[PDB]
Amino acid sequence: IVWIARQFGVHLTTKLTQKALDLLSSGASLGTVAAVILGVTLPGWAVAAAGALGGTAA
């Protein structure tokens, strides 16, 4: 989540992180979480690059 926020210009709050992590952990895809929570439509290469990290780092 941190890498996404950094690379795509999102102001990341602790609340946005908390929501994203729970949703990812429950089974929503990294792309959908990025779009819905972080407001960022990720290209394919960015979904892959972020997905290589642990969830908080992603």
Residue numbers in the entry: 1 to 58
Give the published text:
Of these, circular bacteriocins (class I) have gained attention due to their unique characteristics of high thermal and pH stability, as well as resistance to degradation by many proteolytic enzymes.
A crystal from these conditions diffracted to 1.8 Å resolution and belonged to the space group C2221. The crystal structure diffraction data were phased by molecular replacement using a theoretical α-helix (8 residues long polyalanine) as a search model. There are two independent molecules of plantacyclin B21AG in the asymmetric unit. Helix α1 and helix α4 are linked covalently between Ile1 and Ala58 in the middle of helix α4, creating a circular backbone. The second, third and fourth α-helices are predominantly hydrophobic, with the linked amino acids at the N- and C-termini in helix α4 buried in the core of the structure. In contrast, helix α1 is amphipathic, with hydrophilic residues (Thr14, Gln18, Ser25 and Ser26) exposed at the surface of the protein. The protein has an overall net charge of + 3 at physiological pH, with four cationic residues located in helix α1 (Lys15 and Lys19), helix α4 (Arg6) and the loop connecting α1/α4 (His11), and one anionic residue located in helix α1 (Asp22).
